Symmetry: C3
């Protein structure tokens, strides 16, 4: 099947993607941002080198790369998880991470949201910064993260009302018995979905 996998950043979503790829042969796990960066370098190289470079040029060009990234992902034939974000926080507010052409071209069966406890999100984001990852990203509060996760629900139901797809919310907000168990439980629920 096809599913779009989403959650707030820095909370373990990549750990879920990396571990799915390892436990399922009949599965491609692609990162929509990676492909968008890849197809950007292609179209205009002197203007594109690093990952952040994507944002600089006008939306007319950025949209047209999102179209082509989507089309390539659409060539994938086996099971597909597309790793993406329902929305990003900006000084102007939240902004959709998808565009409507992304869902028409990928024709996913549904959207998966990983919902984390905000205290975990804060802890994990702060130990990665201490290691050296996501420097000068604002320390968000518990209610910031809560607000982001609700908004994410709304975006996804909107896309469901428009495109007739499933909306699957995985609860990872309980206390872990051991480390990386949240990702373990996410990874088992998602394979159960692909195998049902």
């Amino acid at each position: 099947m096809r599913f779009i996998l989403t959650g707030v950043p820095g909370a373990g979503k990549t750990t879920v993607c990396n571990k799915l790829a390892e436990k399922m042969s009949n599965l491609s796990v692609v990162n929509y941002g990676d492909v968008i960066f890849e197809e950007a370098k292609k179209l205009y190289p002197s203007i594109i080198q690093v990952r952040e470079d994507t944002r600089k040029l006008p939306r007319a060009d950025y949209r047209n790369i999102q179209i082509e990234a989507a089309k390539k992902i659409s060539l994938i034939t086996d099971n597909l998880i597309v790793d993406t974000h329902m929305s990003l926080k900006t000084p102007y507010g939240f902004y959709p991470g998808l565009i409507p052409e992304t869902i028409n071209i990928i024709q996913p069966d549904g959207i998966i949201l990983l919902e984390f406890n905000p205290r975990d999100v804060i802890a994990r984001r702060e130990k990665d910064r201490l290691a050296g990852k996501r420097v000068t990203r604002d320390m968000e509060s518990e209610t910031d993260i809560l607000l982001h996760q609700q908004v994410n629900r709304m975006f996804a139901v909107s896309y469901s009302a428009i495109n007739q797809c499933y909306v699957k919310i995985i609860d990872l907000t309980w206390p872990q018995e051991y480390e990386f168990q949240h990702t373990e439980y996410a990874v088992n629920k998602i394979i159960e979905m692909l195998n049902f």
Copy 2:
């Protein structure tokens, strides 16, 4: 007027629909699911015999039935209540009961969401089940919030009303919720 009437399953929406059919003529109450299931046994006799088998159908085939099922309803005159569900829970997640075209074909004035206390829902579902007819109060809270988000999306898209009928208070006598819901809806139809 025409309203889409909705709520989580097993909670009393069917009792509300029946007491409308009892207490207000000049009004057609139509169960959208029954219409759809019937129309599925006409076109694909073989594949469908469980209402659950409606999505074994390829998307284009399942779309087309819900279009047709909508057209028949669409041909009705005077007041009309279309009983259905904003979403249903499946192993892949929440899925919408309406499709984009359903709303335009039927041109409803608004959507009605019957909202219950999840504790009354657990109790009611288990009562029924005991007489022949699996979710926590958190699962049910989530479901009612999703239906609320589906409703508001359908309203932004087709410019219709979104009526939330609050049935979450404790009853002073049995079937009070149902009275209250029917009176609120009849008052909406007459105004």
Copy 3:
């Protein structure tokens, strides 16, 4: 830039609009519904003399006035704020204040939501009937106002899923240490947005 500015009624949104236009230079502030009153008088002057009189216009020609109002607003060329409502409570339930035409015609960059604590909203709506503004008393509860605000978020995020715009939630729910502090805060957050 262009933002649509919204909030439950009677809570402080018009105060915010007035303070913005008196403070930040060369910023246009427009109240969609005032523009709609004018457009209905120039068009139907025998039948609407009070703005409240538009109800008995056919819903089909009222819609046309919203478009004509939207078309006028769309010719403003500097920074722009459109004061309006995401939804209003009627006896048929909530109804959207915008129409799709309004947003495609105005091409707003963003939607701004002023979120208030419902006790403040009740208190403000009360002080304003004592100042002879409204003739009749508002009986919405605390939970009515939370509900109205929750529905307004969902409308905002839908318009953003559909039109690809920002959704900015300005939290005015904390308690005021002094008078008019919320309004001050929302004004300064919005100006910081426009000068970013």
